[PDB]
Design a protein around this ligand. Structure first.
Ligand code: ZN
Ligand code: ZN
Ligand code: ZN
Ligand code: ZN
Ligand code: ZN
Lengths: 391, 382
């Protein structure tokens, strides 16, 4: 993989937020003659695969088409682990298990699969002193955040350093292959054990070009979200930026060391929160206690894939609460300067937030997973790793 | 790349058509030991790239969106030689050389690019005593067939062993990638210098298109079954535009001119090597021919309009069959019914016979290198 090298990079504390870098070439072969290009970077295949051997790839599902989900698997680079995180119909789950075993069997490759509403998992967490997501029904509640918590525990238990997430909603297994290598690309390029890789794919329309009156309005929001994020940064920085182009980077990857360090939000605020949290924690505008991070800093990679991201999902409550969740997390940052709060307030109640006079509900964040006793977890799950493990 | 073993295999003279193999895993990684569970074929990435290192990838273009074409190039594996075969409008073509020079520069890799209508390329073939594709205006005529001819020439000249074609129409570089790797996979499973790889992929108009194809592949299995005496289901890729093939095999095939190429390709393999005729090719008689049909994980989203475009695709195809010197009476017969049953015309009406170009072996490369001598560098892209 050849990548362009971000011409600019945003320094915010010990955070290093790099501009969007385009993938120039998907598979740039086996390097022998290095030629040193200053402007771009050629990732050697074998390096990429070595990173991927240390990577778990989480593929969440809640009653996704199987045909699609299986197609997503075929495309995942061989070296990566593969964890299917499930919240599907009791019996749909069963099919997914069957689907994964067959695949893993045939591809001679290891995999785990688990279910959000599994009670063992609920016990596992509270044994490790992290009861924070358990429902009243006595088990880990549904939610995006809740999913990741389970994902990161398995990543951890499995001994991988890197974990990244793929949307099973993808007609294109080749697109998946690129997205995963791009994570590897990111961690390769990275120079600190605290790293995040956030994929995007961005598209230019026009007056004489079709997109449907719903793909259009989807761009109109991410643009604003990214905006609201640079508004937050700029607010602290004093210098107006435009570096975040990935506020809603659902498909993202993150070194476990970084992952376990961040808090997490429940709704659509997740992706946007990640960023906010990183800046709150490592922006400098606060005492930062953590030695190793302050010492190596954080790099956030924003990589632009060659393949279109075509995931089937739309309508109001999607695209709308998409907006509300995000600008709420900004309004509430411990980093917001008054003008940032206000600028953001307006877009909300002047697009429905029931005014005048109204505030978004604050973020509801889980605490970092560093908290969680992993040994207690390993002890608490002894007699069940059979059933998570797919031979 | 892991893929399924083909269920069965049609032996026909020294030709063997393999049944479809589904790609199961996009990238199987690096083998260092084996439990090669013979259910499937696991293919090492080193071996794949070693093959790619001797493969030309032709990308034709006739006035293609440019973003669309860059995209495609980005998805070609590194080890492959990139051949852009243009017949675009004059300055669209200038944009093309530009686009490719910038690509190949930044990605540190060799490309070729030529324009079908270039006067030097006429001379070049003249000299090598293959004057056939040159037309009235003293230039090579437009057409799928003619494109390929020029493309095989460069492939040859540049000493690559395998040539594959790829459709610039693709919205997904990641698809391109799987495609080109698929080609390599075929050659790597090939147990013969002479091999073919054909890619396939299993809207009321798409329906009409799907149907037209079912019918095309049918006609091709009747042709086969007609000679062996036993019905075969094999051949699912009668119209497989995206195919690769080994140069040895390419320079040996005659070439039908337009919408008839891919089917004719199959027909000719059978006439020539299917053992019903005098076969003098010490090498082909002795290594034989493998045809691979590979089903890709990645869909094919080539925008292809015109309803009648597809009608043409049909007549095109049943024509090559009707006219094979291998069609029994009853094959010649069914095809016919079927045809005039939606076109062809009259109570009866013999579809036009195929205008074929003869094999490119009939050509003298060194004459050609001679003639292209002072020019190889407007074709070579630094
Ligand atoms: Zn810049
Ligand atoms: Zn995506
Ligand atoms: Zn069959
Ligand atoms: Zn021999
Ligand atoms: Zn295709």
């Amino acid at each position: 993989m050849r990548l362009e090298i971000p011409n600019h990079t945003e320094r915010f504390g010990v955070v290093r937020l790099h501009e969007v870098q385009r993938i120039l070439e998907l598979d740039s072969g086996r390097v022998r003659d290095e030629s040193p290009a200053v402007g771009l970077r050629r990732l050697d295949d074998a390096d990429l695969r070595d990173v991927l051997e240390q990577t778990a790839i989480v593929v969440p599902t809640r009653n996704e088409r199987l045909k699609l989900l299986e197609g997503v698997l075929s495309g995942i680079p061989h070296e990566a682990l593969i964890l299917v995180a499930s919240n599907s119909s009791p019996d749909r789950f069963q099919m997914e298990r069957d689907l994964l075993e067959e695949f893993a069997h045939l591809t001679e490759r290891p995999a785990l699969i688990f279910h959000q509403k599994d009670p063992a998992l609920a016990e596992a967490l509270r044994a490790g002193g992290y009861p924070h997501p358990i429902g009243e029904d006595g088990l880990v509640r549904s939610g995006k955040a809740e999913g990741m918590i389970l994902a990161l525990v398995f990543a951890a238990l499995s001994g991988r350093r890197y974990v990244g997430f793929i949307d099973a909603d993808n007609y294109f297994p080749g697109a998946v292959w690129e997205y995963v290598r791009a994570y590897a690309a990111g961690f390769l390029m990275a120079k600190t054990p605290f790293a995040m890789v956030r994929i995007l794919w961005r598209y230019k329309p026009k007056l004489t070009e079709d997109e449907g009156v719903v793909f259009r309005r989807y761009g109109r929001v991410s643009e604003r979200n990214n905006r609201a994020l640079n508004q937050l940064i700029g607010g602290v920085s004093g210098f107006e930026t435009d570096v975040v182009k990935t506020a809603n980077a659902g498909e993202h990857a993150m070194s476990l060391g970084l992952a376990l360090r961040l808090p997490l939000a429940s709704g659509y605020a997740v992706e946007p929160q990640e960023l906010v949290s990183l800046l709150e924690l490592y922006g400098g505008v606060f005492p930062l206690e953590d030695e190793e991070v302050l010492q190596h800093g954080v790099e956030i990679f924003q990589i632009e894939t060659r393949n279109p991201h075509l995931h089937e999902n739309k309508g109001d409550e999607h695209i709308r609460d998409m907006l509300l969740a995000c600008l709420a997390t900004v309004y509430h940052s411990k980093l917001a300067t008054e003008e940032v709060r206000q600028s953001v307030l307006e877009e909300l109640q002047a697009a429905g937030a029931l005014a005048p006079g109204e505030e978004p509900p604050p973020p509801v964040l889980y605490p970092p997973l560093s908290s969680l006793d992993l040994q207690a977890v390993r002890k608490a799950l002894r007699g069940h790793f059979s059933r998570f493990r797919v031979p």
